[PDB]
Design a protein around this nucleic acid. Structure first.
Ligand code: MG
Ligand code: MG
Ligand code: MG
Ligand code: MG
Ligand code: MG
Lengths: 17, 211, 91, 182, 127
RNA sequence: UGAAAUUCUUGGAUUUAUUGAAGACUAACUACUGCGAAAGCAUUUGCCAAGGACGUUUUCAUUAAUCAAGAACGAAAGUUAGGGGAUCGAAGAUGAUCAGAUACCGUCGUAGUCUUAACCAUAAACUAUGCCGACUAGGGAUCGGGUGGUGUUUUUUUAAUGAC
């Protein structure tokens, strides 16, 4: 599903944060 | 005591038939006492968007040298290619590896030239790492592949055919397809083309090029 | 009558008197980040409207949300609630 | 008023703030300047074009282009809106490296010295010189009037060369007083 | 029906140049500098100098026949600053207001891959 | 320049464009991340040898830690003899010597900056923090290797690799 993309985005935000 | 523009005369430049729009403006010169000597060797740089009528080429500029003159028409030939500085500064970004290759090669018409290609690593769809640096081995492999592709494309073609390849960016597609397995990439482009040496002039090759 | 600092901030919150400083940093005071758009942090509320006299109030634990890219205070938090939140993130 | 176009490429790190603020960006451009606005997602650049029928001010298109460019460099929206409102605001830019070749911890401290604790030193300069300063890593941009920006540049350069913030702050008060006199 | 030129703007610290030439660049149509439009050397770099300079070149260009110009702004570059200053911006704004069509705006500041040592020295310059 | 003045300039300066020559340096990517005993180390390609870590049901069996004596290297500056001499530039000369936020500014520039064969062996040569060995908390990020998945992408024939 496309919800997987959302999981990638939020993890990306965490890591860079 | 003399306004120079009284003695000036206007001339209209024309482009290669490889480009869609042959009209690229006009220039001027002192009238012959000859004008042709001043016209020969003149170069004009123009964005590919104007010649092809599409904004997709807005970041690409072509330098064309005046090689012949006939009846106020200045017949030019391809002399060089480059990108706009803004586009290059846009492509270069933090947290990625810049891979650049340069190759010196001569066409089938004895046009010795130098091609500079640039590319950048990219993160994949499921990437969660901040950056996408590539190991030096991958960089070297990609550089070898790019150099081989550029040499093959240039050697097995004429200069007009070379530009016919540059305009649709087929070479970039071939490069990314070849370098795909080594490492995912983005912004693969033929950054620059320099014309180092020129063969003996042949007006026939210019007329046939211009129809 | 007299008013304590924290109640004053709550009453001024729905008015235009109250402004929030940037999140504080240090031991004890730390920005617990629930999510890209959620965080819990201590701020220094400023009461009053540089031509008038305003002053800073006692630091308070607040719940901040990134709505339209700006951090907006939704609710105030007690010290115990903030401390529990910090542990809840650690576990 | 002829049909013309402008393009300004927004860098990746600023476009989300453009998304954050764009609701307040297209209104002034379209109503006041009578400018027809768009940005290309494919190229990620704002496209401005002069509409010959409705646009009236010849300088509108360039005014809008600089307005976005002001926003692109990192200036806050309202700070950039002054550019649309006025006509005598310009942006000055330079690197620390032209002032002095600072690297490593020397470079980091120089940037910190300009900003000051909690940005106070930068907040000092902006008010005294009546300008705005954006400290984009080693990249400095100053927005304001021509005479105003030059005083701001001098103070910033003094900090880079090693002048301690305190003596710089004292000078700012002096020039600030002279600004009120004139 | 639309003949093009190139408006070369060189914005230095102490003056601004407005130089309009043909597309090739070889033949100059009109060159004006902030020095000629101002009484004192201090205001040569002033934007007020630039707008006077820009307007004069625009007036000459209309007389010649040039109606559109491609803008190639630049700074001193080299080992010095790489971004055009306010003088260049003011001239560019004037050209738009002058009525000449602005085809394309591009920065061609000389940017060195790696350069020689700068004038300032170790302790710096531009106190 | 704060304003000027030495300076160049109707023999065309500054600026534009087509080239050519010389000597340095490797921007942006670039990050206290990586390598090296340290000093240090950044364009492409080839050759020469060298090295950590990882994997090993391979091999020798105490061969090891520290180290007065003694030896190799040792930033920048500096000396001897050749070469080179673009930029910057101690010294020296010279314009101006009016005004305190811009109060040390400008022009010419010797030695040097580069390189070859040897000397000199000093730095805040800093983690102001000897070397080897053991033990004493949780947490997720990164660099190199390795193991595992019936995980995604790719090979757009499969696949196997590569990247996640
Ligand atoms: Mg690396
Ligand atoms: Mg010598
Ligand atoms: Mg020795
Ligand atoms: Mg050191
Ligand atoms: Mg130990």
């Amino acid at each position: 599903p496309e919800e997987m993309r959302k999981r990638t985005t939020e993890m990306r935000l965490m890591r860079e944060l | 005591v003399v306004d120079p523009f009284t003695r000036k005369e206007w001339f209209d430049i024309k482009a290669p038939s490889t480009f869609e729009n042959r009209n690229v403006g006009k220039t001027l010169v002192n009238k012959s006492t000859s004008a042709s000597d001043a016209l020969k060797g003149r170069v004009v740089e123009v964005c590919l968007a104007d010649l092809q009528g599409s904004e997709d080429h807005s970041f690409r500029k072509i330098k064309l040298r005046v090689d012949e003159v006939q009846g106020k028409n200045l017949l030019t030939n391809f002399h060089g290619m480059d990108f706009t500085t803004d586009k290059l500064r846009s492509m270069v970004r933090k947290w990625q590896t810049l891979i650049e290759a340069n190759v010196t090669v001569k066409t089938s018409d004895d046009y010795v030239l130098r091609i500079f290609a640039i590319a950048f690593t990219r993160k994949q769809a499921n990437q969660v790492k901040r950056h996408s640096y590539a190991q030096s081995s991958h960089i070297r492999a990609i550089r070898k592949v790019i150099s081989e592709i550029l040499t093959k494309e240039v050697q097995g073609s004429t200069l007009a055919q070379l530009t016919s390849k540059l305009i649709p960016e087929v070479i970039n597609k071939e490069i990314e397809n070849a370098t795909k397995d080594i490492f995912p990439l983005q912004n693969i482009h033929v950054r620059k083309v320099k014309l180092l040496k020129q063969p003996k002039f042949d007006v026939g090759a210019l007329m046939a090029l211009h129809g | 009558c007299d008013i304590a600092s924290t109640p004053l901030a709550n009453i001024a919150r729905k008015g235009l008197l109250l402004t929030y400083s940037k999140p504080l940093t240090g031991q004890g005071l730390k920005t617990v980040n629930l999510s890209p758009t959620e965080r819990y942090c201590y701020v220094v509320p400023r009461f009053g409207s540089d031509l008038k006299i305003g002053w800073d109030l006692n630091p308070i634990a607040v719940h901040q949300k990134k709505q339209k890219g700006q951090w907006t205070v939704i609710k105030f938090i007690t010290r115990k609630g903030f401390q529990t939140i910090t542990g809840e993130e650690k576990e | 008023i002829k049909f013309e176009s402008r393009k300004i490429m927004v860098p990746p790190h600023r476009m989300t703030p453009l998304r954050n603020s764009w609701t307040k960006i297209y209104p002034p451009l379209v109503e006041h300047l009578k400018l027809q606005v768009r940005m290309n997602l494919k190229t990620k650049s704002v496209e401005l074009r002069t509409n010959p029928k409705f646009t009236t001010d010849p300088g509108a298109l360039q005014k809008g282009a600089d307005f976005i460019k002001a926003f692109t460099l990192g200036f806050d929206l309202d700070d950039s809106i002054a550019l649309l409102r006025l006509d005598d605001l310009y942006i000055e830019t330079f690197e620390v490296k032209d002032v002095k070749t600072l690297t490593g911890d020397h470079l980091s401290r120089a940037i910190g010295r300009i900003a000051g604790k909690d940005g106070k030193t930068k907040f000092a300069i902006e008010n005294a010189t009546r300008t705005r300063i954006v400290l984009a890593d080693s990249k400095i941009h100053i927005l304001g009037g021509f005479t105003h920006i030059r005083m701001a540049r001098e103070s910033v350069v003094s900090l880079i060369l090693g002048s301690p913030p305190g003596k710089v702050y004292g000078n700012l008060r002096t020039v600030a007083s002279r600004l009120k006199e004139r | 029906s639309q003949v093009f030129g190139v408006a070369r703007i060189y914005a230095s610290f102490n003056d601004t140049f407005v130089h309009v030439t043909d597309l090739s660049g070889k033949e100059t149509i009109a060159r004006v500098t902030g020095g000629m439009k101002v009484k004192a050397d201090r205001d040569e770099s002033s934007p007020y100098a630039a707008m006077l300079a820009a307007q004069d070149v625009a007036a000459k260009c209309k007389e010649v026949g040039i109606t559109a110009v491609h803008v190639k702004i630049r700074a001193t570059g080299g080992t010095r600053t790489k971004t055009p200053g306010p003088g260049g911006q003011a001239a560019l704004r004037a050209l738009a207001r002058s009525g000449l069509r602005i085809g394309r705006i591009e920065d061609v500041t000389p940017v060195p891959s790696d350069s020689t040592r700068k004038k300032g020295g170790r302790r710096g310059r531009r106190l």
